[PDB]
Design a binder for this molecule. Structure first.
Ligand SMILES: *[C@@H]1O[C@H](CO)[C@@H](O[C@@H]2O[C@H](CO)[C@@H](O)[C@H](O)[C@H]2NC(C)=O)[C@H](O)[C@H]1NC(C)=O
Lengths: 35, 72
């Protein structure tokens, strides 16, 4: 949302997830999982 | 009919809000003429897209909500 209230927290996972092709990508909080 | 149950179902930004009101009636025709306001009871953070719905089974009525101003 443009009027979003909250906090965004992020950190590197280069030593955790990287190896890795198991992460896929292409309204507010719309979660479209259609294939 | 002996009992009237009214609900409002709206789904905004992933939140499904349910409002309702129960009251006794004595009428075998249609919705009684009169006024009452419904109150929120349940808020389900579903994240689910809703475009259609169905009722599971006693008559029921379906109307649609519009973004109109009211003086309450
Ligand atoms: C909820 O589902 C409806 C379909 O039932 C989506 O409406 C379609 O959106 C696509 C966008 O590319 C259009 O091409 C279709 O023509 C639309 N269909 C109809 C019947 O209008 C709607 O976008 C979905 N909404 C969310 C938030 O997921």
């Amino acid at each position: 949302p443009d009027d979003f209230t909250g906090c965004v927290i992020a950190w590197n996972s280069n030593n955790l997830d990287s190896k890795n092709y198991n992460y896929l990508y292409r309204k507010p909080f719309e979660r479209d999982i259609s294939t | 009919f002996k009992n009237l149950r009214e609900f409002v179902f709206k789904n905004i930004d992933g939140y499904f809000k349910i409002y309702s009101k129960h009251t006794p009636i004595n009428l075998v025709r249609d919705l009684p003429q009169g006024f009452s306001a419904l109150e929120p009871l349940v808020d389900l953070p579903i994240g689910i897209n809703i475009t259609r719905f169905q009722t599971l089974l006693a008559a029921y009525y379906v109307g649609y909500l519009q973004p109109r101003t009211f003086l309450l």
